[PDB]
Automatic annotation (TrEMBL):
<keyword id="KW-0051">Antiviral defense</keyword>
<dbReference type="InterPro" id="IPR013422">
    <property type="entry name" value="CRISPR-assoc_prot_Cas5_N"/>
</dbReference>
<dbReference type="InterPro" id="IPR053725">
    <property type="entry name" value="CRISPR_Cas5_sf"/>
</dbReference>
<protein>
    <submittedName>
        <fullName>Type I-A CRISPR-associated protein Cas5</fullName>
    </submittedName>
</protein>
<dbReference type="InterPro" id="IPR010153">
    <property type="entry name" value="CRISPR-assoc_prot_Cas5a-typ"/>
</dbReference>
<comment type="function">
    <text>CRISPR (clustered regularly interspaced short palindromic repeat) is an adaptive immune system that provides protection against mobile genetic elements (viruses, transposable elements and conjugative plasmids). CRISPR clusters contain spacers, sequences complementary to antecedent mobile elements, and target invading nucleic acids. CRISPR clusters are transcribed and processed into CRISPR RNA (crRNA).</text>
</comment>
<dbReference type="GO" id="GO:0051607">
    <property type="term" value="P:defense response to virus"/>
</dbReference>
<comment type="similarity">
    <text>Belongs to the CRISPR-associated protein Cas5 family. Subtype I-A/Apern subfamily.</text>
</comment>
Amino acid sequence: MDILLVCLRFPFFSVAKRSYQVRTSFLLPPPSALKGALAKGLILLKPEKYASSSLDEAALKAIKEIESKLVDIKAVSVAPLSPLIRNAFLLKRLRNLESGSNAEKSDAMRREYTFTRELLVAYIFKNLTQEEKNLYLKAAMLIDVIGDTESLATPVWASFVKPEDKKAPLAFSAPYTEIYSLRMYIEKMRVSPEYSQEEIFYLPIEERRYKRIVYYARIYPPEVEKALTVDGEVLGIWIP
RNA sequence: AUUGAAAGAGUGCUUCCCCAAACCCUUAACUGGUUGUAACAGUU
């Protein structure tokens, strides 16, 4: 039982809801975005099994393999330790995807983003082989973008941390289906990527303010018997 | 390769041009370094 822990000092990401005329984003990267980034890294390493007729089904089978090697659908988690905040960006995005209306149709969409400093990302596996563990360790890097291509990501280091079975407060995401008894945040982040199911995620991140805004930080973590230590502090990852 | 793939709030704009801190305006005036005092006494 090992956990792939990756540190990335990415500046921004954009992952919106079912949104139009504006794209308000999640406070933390969704599991789907992390899985897509890992699939991109795996494809970049070697397309010995990810190369086929179409890119759509190739990405679909890459995500299927990732889910198969992960314990379950809601396995990969993300946890910040720096105060992250949500800001707004107005960019001229094309809206030609609508019914007709030529192809150069573009409007100034308020594509808002989320600024931060540093986050931890944990992947849960099922005792993968040494060759595959090395492949995923070298796939833990090459995360050169998160969410949209307008905001990129940059990993710092990757490691294989052990659960070590110590009781401590947690900071990583966990599904709300089984977490009821545990200052609390909760939304849906589409854990299953859509390539052409119903669950809600929980985040231990509050709102806070400085003058009239909200910069999201973490306070009063709940108690979970599963936690580990890294970089001198203590984090907590839920285990199904 | 990620509710993500494509993605200009962006494209031109003299805060500009005109406009004397400008004009009139004797530190000016009245007023002594002034007054007294042997380089002196004495010397082959």
